[PDB]
């Protein structure tokens, strides 16, 4: 078997990094449990590589996860930070909270999209064995 999950993730100015955690009993992998860090572009790399593999003609290939969009929150944030003398006391705290809620919503959506993609692959008889998928899970 081959179980994949994303237990944490990090939003920076220009990228989103996901921790990709694998547990497997399969002998092809270097070890039975490991974790790597991947950006969204690595998932798109994986998806496009699979789509372009001619031996996979006829196979259902799961759709790529959506591009995370933190642009709104991040800015509100970058400013609320520049506005340390911005009416808080309290308001700064209140605005930090509302913005955290906005980040949590985007994280929940995008972690779910990224994780479901990997899980669909893990269960695919052919794609689960793909060498590029293995690189994606193990490269560190």
């Amino acid at each position: 078997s081959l179980q994949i999950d994303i237990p944490d993730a990090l939003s920076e100015r220009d990228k989103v990094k996901f921790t990709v955690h694998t547990k497997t009993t399969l002998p092809t992998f270097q070890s039975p449990e490991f974790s790597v860090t991947r950006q969204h572009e690595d998932f798109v790399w994986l998806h496009d590589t699979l789509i372009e593999t001619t031996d996979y003609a006829g196979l259902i290939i799961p759709p790529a996860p959506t591009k995370p969009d933190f642009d709104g929150p991040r800015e509100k944030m970058q400013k609320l930070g520049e506005g340390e003398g911005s009416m808080t006391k309290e308001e700064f705290a209140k605005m930090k909270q509302e913005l955290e809620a906005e980040y949590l919503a985007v994280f929940k959506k995008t972690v779910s999209s990224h994780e479901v993609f990997l899980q669909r692959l893990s269960s695919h008889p052919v794609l689960s064995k793909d060498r590029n998928f293995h690189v994606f899970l193990e490269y560190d």
Partner: peptide, 20 residues
């Protein structure tokens, strides 16, 4: 930067605004 932790053993994803 904002760090996300998926919730563990009952409870509750969390987010923290990263600081140094």
């Amino acid at each position: 930067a904002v760090q996300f932790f998926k919730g563990k053993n009952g409870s509750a994803d969390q987010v923290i605004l990263v600081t140094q």
